[PDB]
Symmetry: C3
Subunit: 112 residues, 3 copies
């Protein structure tokens, strides 16, 4: 099993959620985060008026899935989160050694 952690634009997140649900990926945890990327470099200026590059709001999605589903999930998120402009985000694939379902105590892919 792997944890897929994707940082996506808030405007794209509804489309990412719907693309996952259509393919039966219902379990997901979402956090409001802020981030920056390469765009902007060290500093910006406008006016002005020189400023740090701003940490701007993004949506973090975490979805833990079976190893065989990882590339399907990655593509569903990429196709739905993409816009073509800097700031579209990244997806990190993190190993998960086990999962426990709190309601029943079930572990393993069973737990997903």
């Amino acid at each position: 099993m792997k944890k897929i952690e994707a940082i996506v634009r808030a405007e794209k997140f509804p489309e990412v959620k719907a693309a996952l649900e259509e393919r039966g990926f219902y379990g997901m945890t979402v956090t409001d985060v802020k981030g920056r990327g390469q765009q902007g470099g060290m500093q910006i200026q406008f006016r002005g008026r020189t400023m740090e590059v701003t940490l701007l709001p993004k949506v973090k999605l975490e979805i833990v899935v079976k190893d065989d589903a990882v590339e399907e999930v990655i593509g569903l998120i990429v196709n739905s989160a993409f816009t073509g402009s800097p700031g579209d985000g990244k997806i990190f694939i993190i190993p998960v050694e086990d999962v426990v379902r709190i309601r029943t105590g079930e572990r393993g892919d069973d737990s997903l």
Copy 2:
């Protein structure tokens, strides 16, 4: 060492925190998140107009512990977070390769 990431009901979280503390697991990081599970399937209705399944508030607990403490901490969270209804949450066990204590630079199980 392992990172234990548990998504639990907000109403149960204070019981989880107290169960951990009673056994001397004091360090922990908590985030307000939103999530859905399998309950609801692809969509719901009510007096609609069908509606998406709502992402609802949950609490994310992250606790990094030595490997020999993982099973104990999983039991403390399962017992304290349980209600028996869908939405009780899941626990993910994620490998950690190292830990550093910022105050002193100490690494390894020592840093915990």
Copy 3:
């Protein structure tokens, strides 16, 4: 690749961000979190009833970098986040098996800059 997850004081986060940026680490994801550590033990004093130890606001920084950058980034965070009091934070190094750039679909060696 590794995910470096650091929990630091909010007062020090601007210095951490500046330290990273000065060395060219620009990609980062930050979350407001709350935490406690060992300080306070099982309960606090006042008044005159006991109170639980409070979960207080912190800043969580996640930065994913190539393996050859991990020690550099750790030192940049420790040296900018340090104050010398309990509550300074911890850094967790977590394996990452792959990274995908959404804009381009690149992965692996092409998904993070070489620093």
